[PDB]
Each structure stands twice: as C-alpha cells, then as structure tokens.
Amino acid sequence: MRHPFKVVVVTGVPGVGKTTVIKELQGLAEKEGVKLHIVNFGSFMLDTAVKLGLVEDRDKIRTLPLRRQLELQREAAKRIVAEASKALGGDGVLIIDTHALVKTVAGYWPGLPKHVLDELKPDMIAVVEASPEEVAARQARDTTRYRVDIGGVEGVKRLMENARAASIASAIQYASTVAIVENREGEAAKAAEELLRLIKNL
Amino acid sequence: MRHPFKVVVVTGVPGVGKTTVIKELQGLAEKEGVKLHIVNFGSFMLDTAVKLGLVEDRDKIRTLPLRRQLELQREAAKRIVAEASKALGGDGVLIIDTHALVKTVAGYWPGLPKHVLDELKPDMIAVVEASPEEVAARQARDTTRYRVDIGGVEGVKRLMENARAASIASAIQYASTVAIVENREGEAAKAAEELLRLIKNL
Amino acid sequence: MRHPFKVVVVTGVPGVGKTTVIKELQGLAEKEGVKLHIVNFGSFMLDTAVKLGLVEDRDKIRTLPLRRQLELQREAAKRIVAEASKALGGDGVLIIDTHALVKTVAGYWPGLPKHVLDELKPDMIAVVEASPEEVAARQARDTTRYRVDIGGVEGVKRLMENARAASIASAIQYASTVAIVENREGEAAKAAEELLRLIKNL
C-alpha cells in the first residue's frame, strides 16, 4: 500500500547531514525537472509543541515525556500526508527529513513506528551515514543545533548501529527499500546525486 | 496505543540478571512511592504448561513444540493484561520480566511478536545487558536454573546480538522506547536506579 | 496465526546455497517419510514478469521499478499459498526458497514484508549462512546465475548483516522462529540435516 505520489523518508543520526543533503537534492531535482515536496518531520512536531507552550527549541522535543512525544509524532505524520496530498500528483515525490531512531530521555525511540508508517506508506527509507568521527566533527562545527546529548563519537556510533536496525524493522511494514547513502566529508552534492538515482528506480 | 497504566517489558539473555535488577527496582520504587505491578511472563506460561502436564520446569518450556509454545505465549500475555488492569490505575507501572528472543529447539523465537505486543502495548522495552563473560559466570554460579543450552560465552554473545535486533523490531509496533540498562558486576542496584529514572520519563 | 500445514521460509544471500540445501532436504525428507511441498518465490515472480514481457531472466527481476516488483511479490505470495493449500494437509511442510532482503536498483528491499507474511504466516524463517569469502567463491563457480551486482565479498558481507536484521524484523509479525543454518563448504547435506531437525520441532 502506496500513495499516488512516491514517499521517501530520509533518516540518519543527528549531525550526519540529512537537511544538507536534502537541500542539495532539491537543487538537483529542480535542474532535472523532478517534482519534490520536502518537509521536516521535527518542524511539524515543533509547530504543535510551541502552540501548546511545551518547548521553544527543536532539540528539546526529545526531552518531553514520551506519551506527549507520541501524540506530537502521530499528529505530525497526519498533517504531513494531508499537505503532501494537496501539493503532489502521481509524478511527485514527498521527501521527509526525519529519524528512524530518536535518543530520548526514556531510551532509543522509533521515529517510524507502525502508526507513522500507516500514514506515510514509504516507498523508501534512505539512511544517510558517515563515520562516527565525521558526524562528531560536523556536530562540533554546527553551533546552530544542540547535539551534545547524542554522546559524541561513542554515542553516535551506538545510535547509528541501533538506527540501522530500526530502519530495517520499519521497512518490513510497507515493503520500503532501505537505501544507504554515504555522506562523505565535503561531498554532500554526490550523496544527493546517489539518492536521486535510487529515487528514480522506485 | 497505550494502556491507562505504563507498561515496561524487561528483556535480556538468560542469566544477565533481569529478575535480580527487577527485585532491586521493587525496593527502590516502594522507597520513592512509585506504584509497580511486577509479573514474570515465563511464570504465566509455566502455570498453564504444568496444568496441561507438559513440563514441570520453567527451563523446559523452550523445548516444547513451537505451536504449543505459541498458544502458551498468547494466553500468558492476555492473563497478564487482565491482572494488571485490576491491580493498577493511571499512576501505576506494569513491569514484565521476559525475553525479546528465546533460544528454542526450532531456533531463536520472538518473545514480543505482534500478537503479544497487541496485548501489552509497551511504553518501553528495557534491554538488560552485561559482557558475555559476565553473563556466562552469572549462569555458572546460579545452580537454581538450567542455562547450559544457551551455549556459554559464545552462545550468549550471539543470542545478545539477535535479541538486541528483536527488541528494536518489536519496538516499531507500538513506538516503545528501547532502553539499554548495563547490569555491571556487583551493581544490580545501580542498574535498577538507571531503569527507574528512564521509567519516570515515559 | 498459522496455516494447517507448517510453513518454512528459507532465506540467505544470493549464492549461499539455499536451492542446493533445499534439494538435499528434499532427499532426506522423502527418505524419512516427511511430506514437503517445495516452491521458489522468485520462480513465481518470474512466471508473471515473463507473461507481462517485463524480463526474461530471474536475475533481472530486482532491476524492475520497485512498484512493479511490489505487485509481482504480492501476487507470488498469494499463488504460493493457494497451491500449497491444495497440495498439503496438516502433516505437511511448505518450503519456500526465497530472500529476507533483495539488493534492488532502489536499495535493500524486504523479501518478507508484512503483506507477504500475512499470506505465508511462517512457522520458521531459516537463514542459510556461510563466510562472505565462501559465498563469493560459490557465486564465481556458478556461471548459470548473474550475481556480480551483489558486490563480491564486501557486498555479500553487508547484505548478510542487513538480511539477518530483516529476518528478525519479519519474524516479529507471526512469531516465526529464526533458525541460522551454516552451509559449510562441501557439507550441504549436513546443513539439510540440521534444518530438518529444527523443522521437526515446529
């Protein structure tokens, strides 16, 4: 079970370069006439959380009580699909910038649980990956975002292993591909090209 | 989808110290006024198996034909939730001492398959972990339990890797957290404190 | 939820020796009077794809657009169960020669997604394994099949790790066992005996 448009969920650990690679994919897509609608799942959760006076910062969402995060995750998924449905026809691709596994105050939490996959029905779960050392250096240089709680090189390495396993488990629900995209240091454009090529085979 | 009470499923390989850490969590919980109802999933399966004359020993359950184990697993999950429902209100936590993966006579068998998760609806799957060598030494010193079939250090190591993967797959169904709890040699009380802290963020 | 017959899904990477080990299991089964019905999931997909003029070669199926592969996978699973239902009673075992993870043109693709498991309801997912080096040498010596796209020793190693994780995730849906069967060089008959022994405990 599939939407009329294609759905690509882009995951990977905080700081790996998802939002960067997606911004490169946007330029490449419009150059080649491929129709995208691009959203950030976290921005949809932040919108609701800010309205409820729960947080002001996207990096505090994962510190909320988990039953509250569950409600924000459910509502974000439904709003994303309603918006995608108005923006895209059968020739379009929904790109969702998100996480397969979130490091919360009560443990590793699936970003693509069954209730979310029942809304998104992904054609593909892309996993953006780099070395733990590369990810830790990208986190250090990016002072716009708080990622110290991910636990530097050792925390990144563990989250990456658990996140790969979550991506595969989530793929079983709607027979999503799992596409591993290497985001090599200084080569975000090349990651975006490899991702586009896989998207064209969906 | 959630019960009115919180549900914490405590997994880890045989001999790792689940039942020990849960006994420490019970003391700490009652000291801090946190309401628990604590069950052992295997004890619920043993009750039915003994009534049917199938086994007399909890360590022989995993040697039954798998269609029989499937029936005992289904009934144990339903009985646990019926009992929890009478014991707990919205301020309580159900603690289920169990396994994400059981080493049976027909291979590794999920302890938290979808039919079980549809009953338990876990807020959290805690994974109690130690080194394979620590687990093998704990099994050797505990002569109350038969665990030789788990396969000592090498068998424990493999089951641990497969069990981590099963815990994450099971977490996708109801967006359960996966909380890794280190049960360090001689520090079961500290594992119980780390678990309690995560439980309070559910 | 179970068929009246037992269902064993036999997975492992291309070239590992699934079809070989199953041919040995067939001889051993008929020698011991164990009733099997044996199918190849890919042959069911090839039948439909050839009728539609899509491919002529079983090794090109994984190069089709993924929405097309999804339709062929759904139809293959339904046809297999309809045929098994006419061939087997409650004393029989359906053996399905297939894959937990297929390396496609749009990434790693689950062979046992939920829509497939809802048809097959496996008692067991057997994982046939060997060293990546053994698998790469078996692929080189077998010129009847195209497997260069799996990526030799390094590609085999990665697919094997991801395929193990997919097998476990797929096992959660219907509480299937996961039985790891070592297909050691020159000992396909012994792998078939170990598999038969596990099958008899279902």
Ligand SMILES: Nc1ncnc2c1ncn2[C@@H]1O[C@H](COP(=O)(O)OP(=O)(O)OP(=O)(O)O)[C@@H](O)[C@H]1O
């Ligand atoms: N291939 C690359 N090489 C070098 N720097 C990169 C690369 N890709 C991204 N970066 C940088 O890494 C930092 C993190 O990138 P980005 O914000 O896109 O990560 P993210 O995965 O979206 O993280 P979050 O999940 O926290 O939103 C940024 O400063 C970005 O410019």
Ligand SMILES: Nc1ncnc2c1ncn2[C@@H]1O[C@H](COP(=O)(O)OP(=O)(O)OP(=O)(O)O)[C@@H](O)[C@H]1O
């Ligand atoms: N942190 C610890 N350090 C040392 N010994 C421990 C620790 N935790 C538990 N033990 C001991 O390890 C042995 C196994 O513990 P326990 O029976 O609680 O394991 P379990 O995980 O419940 O096993 P099963 O799954 O077989 O029931 C016991 O003798 C127990 O006292």
Ligand SMILES: Nc1ncnc2c1ncn2[C@@H]1O[C@H](COP(=O)(O)OP(=O)(O)OP(=O)(O)O)[C@@H](O)[C@H]1O
């Ligand atoms: N244990 C073994 N030792 C040596 N060679 C083996 C062994 N098992 C299988 N082979 C050989 O390995 C090659 C691949 O075997 P086979 O075709 O059965 O693999 P497969 O897993 O069914 O692959 P595919 O998934 O591509 O169909 C064949 O030439 C086969 O004879």
Ligand SMILES: Nc1ncnc2c1ncn2[C@@H]1O[C@H](COP(=O)(O)O)[C@@H](O)[C@H]1O
């Ligand atoms: N699929 C998801 N499920 C749950 N929480 C999510 C998901 N995607 C994003 N988030 C949350 O949103 C925050 C901000 O998103 P991001 O900008 O991608 O880091 C993350 O740190 C998470 O707390």
Ligand SMILES: Nc1ncnc2c1ncn2[C@@H]1O[C@H](COP(=O)(O)O)[C@@H](O)[C@H]1O
């Ligand atoms: N969730 C479960 N699913 C299936 N079998 C279980 C489960 N939990 C416990 N068991 C069985 O019960 C036995 C005794 O439980 P324990 O005392 O935790 O070792 C285990 O060895 C298993 O055979």
Ligand SMILES: Nc1ncnc2c1ncn2[C@@H]1O[C@H](COP(=O)(O)O)[C@@H](O)[C@H]1O
């Ligand atoms: N369960 C499955 N799901 C999807 N594709 C499959 C499945 N089983 C087999 N295939 C496809 O069928 C081809 C031929 O099967 P095989 O002969 O086992 O290699 C594989 O290379 C795949 O492209």
Ligand SMILES: [Cl-]
């Ligand atoms: Cl992720």
Ligand SMILES: [Cl-]
């Ligand atoms: Cl476990």
Ligand SMILES: [Cl-]
């Ligand atoms: Cl496979």
Ligand SMILES: [Mg+2]
């Ligand atoms: Mg981002």
Ligand SMILES: [Mg+2]
């Ligand atoms: Mg115990």
Ligand SMILES: [Mg+2]
């Ligand atoms: Mg074959």
